[PDB]
Structure formats: C-alpha cells, structure tokens
Paper text:
Domain III connects to the C-terminal transmembrane domain via a flexible linker, while domain II bears the fusion loops at the opposite end. The crystal structure of the C. reinhardtii HAPLESS 2 (HAP2) ectodomain (CrHAP2e) revealed that this broadly conserved, gamete-expressed transmembrane protein has the same three-dimensional fold as class II viral fusion proteins.
Monomeric TcHAP2esub domain II displayed the same conformation adopted by domain II in the trimers of both AtHAP2e and CrHAP2e. A surface representation of the modeled TcHAP2 trimer indeed suggests a relatively flat membrane interaction surface with a tripartite nonpolar patch comprising V129 (in the N-terminal side of the bc connection) and L167, L168 and I183, F184 (in the variable regions 2 and 3, respectively, of the cd connection). As anticipated from the aa sequence, the loop preceding α0 is stabilized by an extra disulfide bond, numbered 5b (middle inset).
Residue numbers in the entry: 99 to 126, 129 to 214, 257 to 367, 371 to 382
Write the structure that this text describes.
C-alpha cells in the first residue's frame, strides 16, 4: 500500500562546459594578435563562418617586466624577458579533450501513493548539474552518475565573461586588466577538473566531498515528456 517519498526537479540544459581549459604559449614571422585568420593562435569560427570575438588571444612582450621586481614570479611578460627577450609570446585559450553538459534545476515536487515530510528536500535551484558529454568513448562519460558534479551557480560563468569560473571563455581571457604582467594561466583557475580533483583528494584523506553528485545523494534522470529525482530517507506522516 505504502510507497517511498520522491523528490523530482526539472532539468534545463544551459550549455557545454570544458573540463579543464588551458593557456597554450606559441613562440614566434612575429606574434600576430590581429582579428584576422593570420593570427598566431588563429581565428575561431562559429558553424556559420563568423569569427568568434577574442578567440585570437593576445601577444606578450617583456615590457616593464625588464625592471627588477615589478612583474610577479611566473608572469607572462617576465617569461619573455628571461627566455625570449626582443620577441613576443602568444597567449591562447585552448579547451581540453573532456566536456560536461550543464543543467539548471527547478523546485522540488513531492510524490507518494497509498502534510509535513521526514527529511526536507534539498534546494537545487541555486545550483548546476554537470554531466560528462564528449568525446563519448571517454572513460568519464562511460563512468555515469559516479562522475556527475554539482556546483553553486556562484562558481559558474554562463557567458564566459567572468574569470576563474566554470564556463570561462575568450572574453574573460583577453580583457584581463594588465594581462601580460599577470601569472601564466591566470583566469583559468577553479574549473570543473579542479572541483573533481579537490573532492577525490579530500575523499582519500577520509574527508567530506562537497562537489561530486554522489556526496549529495543517489539520483535518477528519466526522459519523461527531463527530470532529476531522488528517494527521501524514511516514510509518510
């Protein structure tokens, strides 16, 4: 007669997020950062053949990094002063092999069959669910729910205009103030890979994981009419 309490949330696809974006450095004719296909990083294009703004990266020369103790250790410009002075180095935003699908979530809707509940349903509205989506044949994609991640929307940059957030893109990468006097790889911190790695390490240390979906509970994704559901511990009142 009695059934278990169920909590379902509607899933809303947002975009694909790269697991670990990285900065490729190209040694240099000379360094070209012009909005043309002649650029060192090269121009990226949408499926319509339109150039993606800020995709050509930027060049960095020694510059004021010449002056002892002005630029921080490991900065873009400083690397030119030391190994390639006179020349310029291209900073290119590149995307890793692995990609995740980002889903926004709605409100929890209770379910039963034969009122105050035992456990209160978790707020998933202000969070985002990440599921490995490509290259498909990849270990992580095959690994299923084990590899899903759940982050607060605060850690996500939807449009990619914000540095050190999930979904960071060309707009945030160039457009960094004083970019050449900044550390190599700046802006590409706190990514999905970092969120996973931080959990796996803390887990091996016998600590509480905070990002992977498994630390939130055991879920089920059904393609009805798509929803994300979990079973509440306990029973009806």
């Amino acid at each position: 007669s009695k059934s278990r309490v169920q909590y379902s949330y509607p899933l809303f696809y947002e975009r694909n997020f790269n697991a670990k974006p990285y900065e490729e450095e190209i040694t240099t004719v000379g360094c070209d950062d012009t909005f043309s296909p002649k650029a060192t990083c090269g121009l990226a294009m949408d499926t319509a053949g339109r150039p993606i703004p800020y995709s050509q990266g930027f060049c960095c020369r020694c510059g004021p990094c010449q002056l002892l103790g002005l630029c921080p250790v490991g900065s873009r410009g400083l690397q030119v002063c030391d190994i390639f002075r006179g020349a310029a180095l291209a900073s290119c935003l590149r995307f890793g092999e692995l990609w995740y699908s980002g889903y926004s979530m709605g409100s929890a809707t209770i379910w039963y069959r034969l009122f105050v509940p035992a456990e209160l349903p978790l707020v998933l509205s202000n969070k985002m669910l990440f599921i490995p989506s490509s290259p498909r044949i990849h270990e992580r994609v095959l690994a299923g729910q084990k590899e899903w991640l759940i982050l607060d929307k605060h850690h996500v940059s939807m449009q990619g205009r914000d540095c050190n957030k999930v979904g960071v893109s060309y707009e945030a990468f160039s457009g960094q103030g004083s970019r050449c006097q900044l550390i190599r790889g700046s802006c590409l911190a706190d990514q999905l890979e970092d969120y996973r790695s931080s959990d796996l390490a803390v887990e091996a240390r016998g600590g509480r994981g905070k990002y992977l979906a498994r630390f939130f509970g055991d879920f089920v994704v059904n393609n009805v009419n798509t929803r994300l559901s979990y079973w509440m511990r306990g029973s009806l009142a």
